Amino acid sequence: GPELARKLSQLVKTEKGVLRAMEVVASERREAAKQLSLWGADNDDDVSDVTDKLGVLIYELGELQDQFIDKYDQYRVTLKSIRNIEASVQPSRDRKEKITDEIAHLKYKDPQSTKIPVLEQELVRAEAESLVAEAQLSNITREKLKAAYSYMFDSLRELSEKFALIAGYGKALLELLDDSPVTPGEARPAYDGYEASRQIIMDAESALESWTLD
Amino acid sequence: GPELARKLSQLVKTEKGVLRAMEVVASERREAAKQLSLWGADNDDDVSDVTDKLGVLIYELGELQDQFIDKYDQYRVTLKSIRNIEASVQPSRDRKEKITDEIAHLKYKDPQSTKIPVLEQELVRAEAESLVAEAQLSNITREKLKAAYSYMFDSLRELSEKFALIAGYGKALLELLDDSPPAYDGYEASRQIIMDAESALESWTLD
Numbered sequence: 001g002p003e004l005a006r007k008l009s010q011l012v013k014t015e016k017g018v019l020r021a022m023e024v025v026a027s028e029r030r031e032a033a034k035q036l037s038l039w040g041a042d043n044d045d046d047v048s049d050v051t052d053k054l055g056v057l058i059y060e061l062g063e064l065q066d067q068f069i070d071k072y073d074q075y076r077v078t079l080k081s082i083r084n085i086e087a088s089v090q091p092s093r094d095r096k097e098k099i100t101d102e103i104a105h106l107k108y109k110d111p112q113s114t115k116i117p118v119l120e121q122e123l124v125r126a127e128a129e130s131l132v133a134e135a136q137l138s139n140i141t142r143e144k145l146k147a148a149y150s151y152m153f154d155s156l157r158e159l160s161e162k163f164a165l166i167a168g169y170g171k172a173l174l175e176l177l178d179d180s181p182v183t184p185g186e187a188r189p190a191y192d193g194y195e196a197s198r199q200i201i202m203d204a205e206s207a208l209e210s211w212t213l214d
Numbered sequence: 215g216p217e218l219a220r221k222l223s224q225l226v227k228t229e230k231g232v233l234r235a236m237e238v239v240a241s242e243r244r245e246a247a248k249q250l251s252l253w254g255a256d257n258d259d260d261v262s263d264v265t266d267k268l269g270v271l272i273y274e275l276g277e278l279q280d281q282f283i284d285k286y287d288q289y290r291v292t293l294k295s296i297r298n299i300e301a302s303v304q305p306s307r308d309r310k311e312k313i314t315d316e317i318a319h320l321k322y323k324d325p326q327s328t329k330i331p332v333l334e335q336e337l338v339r340a341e342a343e344s345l346v347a348e349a350q351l352s353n354i355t356r357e358k359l360k361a362a363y364s365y366m367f368d369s370l371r372e373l374s375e376k377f378a379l380i381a382g383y384g385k386a387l388l389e390l391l392d393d394s395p396p397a398y399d400g401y402e403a404s405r406q407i408i409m410d411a412e413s414a415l416e417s418w419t420l421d
Contacts, residue, residue, distance in 0.1 A: 021235055160377035185349075
């Protein structure tokens with residue numbers, strides 16, 4: 001590929017892969033949610049509840065990931081767009097180099113030629129074109145770069161601050177589940193953590209609606 | 215394993231899938247960091263500097279992830295552990311089931327006198343074993359389920375908050391880039407950010 005493209009194309013590629021992997025996580029994590037809830041489904045009353053809600057909360061991690069994927073994509077194409085521009089600039093470099101090597105050939109093996117003054121003149125224009133070209137590239141790179149990661153980090157901070165919430169609430173559910181041993185023979189007590197458990201969802205939905213950047 | 219363990223096996227299989235997906239994500243993030251730093255090297259000096267730092271931050275995302283991935287495994291094996299017990303209790307149930315039917319057939323059709331007392335006495339032992347088995351299944355399911363997810367979530371809360379902070383500093387770094395279509399001097403500033411990050415990570419605590 002063109003020279004100034006390569007290193008950025010390598011990164012663009014690697015980042016496609018990171019997306020593809022995040023997709024799988026989110027997908028599978030949602031499958032875990034269901035399988036957990038369905039497993040807990042046919043157990044003791046308390047386990048069947050805690051697990052039901054744990055299935056909701058873990059399902060959201062799924063949805064939340066995928067929302068962050070959509071935005072990662074936007075990050076990735078923005079980079080892709082920078083790479084395309086680093087590609088468009090190559091010609092003006094090759095040209096400068098060719099005109100240089102043409103003079104070098106002609107001055108050395110034919111100094112009498114009348115097309116050296118003209119090529120010399122062509123080279124100053126070419127060099128000028130190349131400077132402008134590269135100045136432009138820079139002002140585009142800087143801007144697209146800044147907008148790129150700037151957007152991605154805000155999205156990642158969202159994802160992650162919302163994960164934080166669900167973890168914290170997720171652990172608040174596990175408080176409902178009693179792990180006090182049982183004597184072989186006698187039964188498990190009454191479980192009335194339903195009002196509480198439903199409350200934890202409502203609290204979690206409340207925290208995720210109201211969350212804002214800063 | 216047998217029937218009682220089926221649904222939990224499915225689950226265990228999926229979390230191995232999730233662990234493995236995560237391992238890839240961390241891995242690549244790390245490649246992305248490097249690749250971003252090395253491309254930045256051929257650019258204006260502000261870009262070269264900021265991009266090398268962004269690299270350091272993003273690399274750490276990847277490491278935090280592997281740190282969480284290790285902890286995720288302990289989670290998964292704690293489930294596998296529950297599954298095993300669900301598996302070894304089945305026979306105990308299947309057995310008690312059998313013996314009782316052996317009495318159900320022996321009674322009604324030739325309620326004969328020689329066998330019963332031997333079967334009657336084998337069922338008392340099976341009930342005994344069933345009780346102890348069910349007790350252990352119940353008690354272990356809850357201790358380990360609670361532990362498993364309790365642990366997992368604290369670790370996830372760790373990964374996330376630490377991500378969140380890194381994301382913060384990532385964005386700060388970008389301010390050192392001049393969106394003005396003058397000599398770069400943000401080295402002091404960018405160092406301070408990384409130093410800040412490392413500081414804010416070292417001093418993180420649950421609770």
